[PDB]
């Protein structure tokens, strides 16, 4: 089998991108943000508390003939950004793009964070990091994917994000005609749940290209590019009038500036980020102080290759016996 849905962005700085998901019997569609940087499956739903949901569309259990209360099962969750939600669980057929799992654990959520109650076009969150990292209580569940694999014609995953503009996520097969040149795998690590992998440098706009390792994840549900200070610092150095602000909480710059390129390595070939898919506006409504896309992972504990840097390609996530990722220019 295969599946295939497009994916979209929130807003007009490509915050998030949010993808259908058919929930139960009959189906129920929500619009859920893809991470691969997580492994829970959760949604607002009827039980979610009231005064927590403001204009997002919920999941009713109670409305599904397929869905099947997971006797004594609980979670709950915390995220990089702070925000956090927990809840009870559900299991329900769910089907991506035309991909259909029967069986799959749907969280249900009782208690969600402001940040989740305040976007309103986020439904909830579908995770596609490893299954080791779901938090689901005192039996841990499989993701989607996981789910999904044995079926898949290939078991593996890609992500096709678009700048200011749609995407695509496949399942089970490779769109030879979504990139260009050929796709380059590198190894992961699975020890810490995540799609970890190690970039071989960076150069910044025009400039000489650095050989140096850069382990991190490659991470759809966060949005900017965090890396080493001393990477972060190299290439904002490049924008006249850019600086760190501890008050913003990162780099900002001139929303006058021209922002350079930045260059990632995967093995010998080399992804291209082009400089405004770096930009992220004003930091208020009215600001010449535009916010940074690249941004220092110091105090994260982990470097990530966000949707700044993933949108710059194609990127196959390959969840063979032994994993990899790959990446190709589009």
């Given at each position: 089998?295969?599946?295939?849905?497009?994916?979209?962005?929130?807003?007009?700085?490509?915050?998030?991108?949010?993808?259908?998901?058919?929930?139960?019997?009959?189906?129920?569609?929500?619009?859920?943000?893809?991470?691969?940087?997580?492994?829970?499956?959760?949604?607002?739903?009827?039980?979610?508390?009231?005064?927590?949901?403001?204009?997002?569309?919920?999941?009713?259990?109670?409305?599904?003939?397929?869905?099947?209360?997971?006797?004594?099962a609980?979670?709950?969750?915390?995220?990089?950004?702070?925000?956090?939600?927990?809840?009870?669980?559900?299991?329900?057929?769910?089907?991506?793009?035309?991909?259909?799992?029967?069986?799959?654990?749907?969280?249900?959520?009782?208690?969600?964070?402001?940040?989740?109650?305040?976007?309103?076009?986020?439904?909830?969150?579908?995770?596609?990091?490893?299954?080791?990292?779901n938090?689901?209580?005192?039996?841990?569940?499989?993701t989607?994917?996981?789910n999904?694999?044995?079926?898949?014609?290939?078991?593996?995953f890609?992500?096709?994000?678009?700048?200011?503009?749609?995407?695509?996520?496949?399942?089970?097969?490779?769109?030879?005609?979504?990139?260009?040149?050929?796709?380059?795998?590198?190894?992961?690590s699975?020890?810490?749940?995540?799609?970890?992998?190690?970039?071989?440098?960076?150069?910044?706009?025009?400039?000489?290209?650095?050989?140096?390792?850069?382990?991190?994840?490659?991470?759809?549900?966060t949005?900017?590019?965090?890396?080493?200070?001393?990477?972060?610092?190299?290439?904002?150095?490049?924008?006249?009038?850019?600086?760190?602000?501890?008050?913003?909480?990162?780099?900002?710059?001139?929303?006058?500036?021209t922002?350079?390129?930045?260059?990632?390595?995967?093995?010998?070939?080399?992804?291209?980020?082009?400089?405004?898919?770096?930009?992220?506006?004003?930091?208020?409504?009215?600001?010449?102080?535009?916010?940074?896309?690249?941004?220092?992972?110091?105090?994260?504990?982990?470097?990530?290759?966000?949707?700044?840097?993933?949108?710059?390609?194609?990127?196959?996530?390959?969840?063979?016996?032994?994993?990899?990722?790959?990446?190709?220019?589009?």
């Amino acid at each position: 089998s295969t599946g295939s849905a497009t994916t979209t962005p929130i807003d007009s700085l490509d915050d998030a991108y949010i993808t259908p998901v058919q929930i139960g019997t009959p189906a129920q569609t929500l619009n859920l943000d893809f991470d691969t940087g997580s492994s829970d499956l959760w949604v607002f739903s009827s039980e979610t508390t009231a005064s927590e949901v403001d204009g997002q569309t919920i999941y009713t259990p109670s409305k599904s003939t397929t869905a099947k209360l997971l006797s004594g099962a609980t979670w709950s969750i915390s995220y990089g950004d702070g925000s956090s939600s927990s809840g009870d669980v559900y299991t329900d057929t769910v089907s991506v793009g035309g991909l259909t799992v029967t069986g799959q654990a749907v969280e249900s959520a009782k208690k969600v964070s402001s940040s989740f109650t305040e976007d309103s076009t986020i439904d909830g969150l579908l995770g596609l990091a490893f299954s080791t990292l779901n938090t689901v209580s005192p039996t841990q569940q499989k993701t989607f994917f996981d789910n999904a694999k044995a079926s898949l014609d290939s078991p593996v995953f890609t992500a096709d994000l678009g700048y200011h503009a749609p995407g695509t996520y496949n399942f089970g097969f490779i769109d030879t005609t979504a990139y260009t040149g050929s796709i380059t795998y590198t190894a992961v690590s699975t020890k810490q749940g995540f799609w970890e992998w190690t970039s071989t440098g960076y150069a910044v706009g025009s400039g000489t290209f650095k050989s140096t390792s850069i382990d991190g994840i490659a991470d759809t549900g966060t949005t900017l590019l965090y890396l080493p200070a001393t990477v972060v610092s190299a290439y904002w150095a490049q924008v006249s009038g850019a600086k760190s602000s501890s008050s913003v909480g990162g780099y900002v710059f001139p929303c006058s500036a021209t922002l350079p390129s930045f260059t990632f390595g995967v093995g010998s070939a080399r992804i291209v980020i082009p400089g405004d898919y770096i930009d992220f506006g004003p930091i208020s409504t009215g600001s010449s102080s535009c916010f940074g896309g690249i941004q220092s992972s110091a105090g994260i504990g982990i470097n990530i290759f966000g949707d700044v840097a993933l949108k710059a390609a194609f990127v196959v996530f390959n969840g063979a016996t032994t994993p990899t990722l790959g990446f190709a220019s589009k």
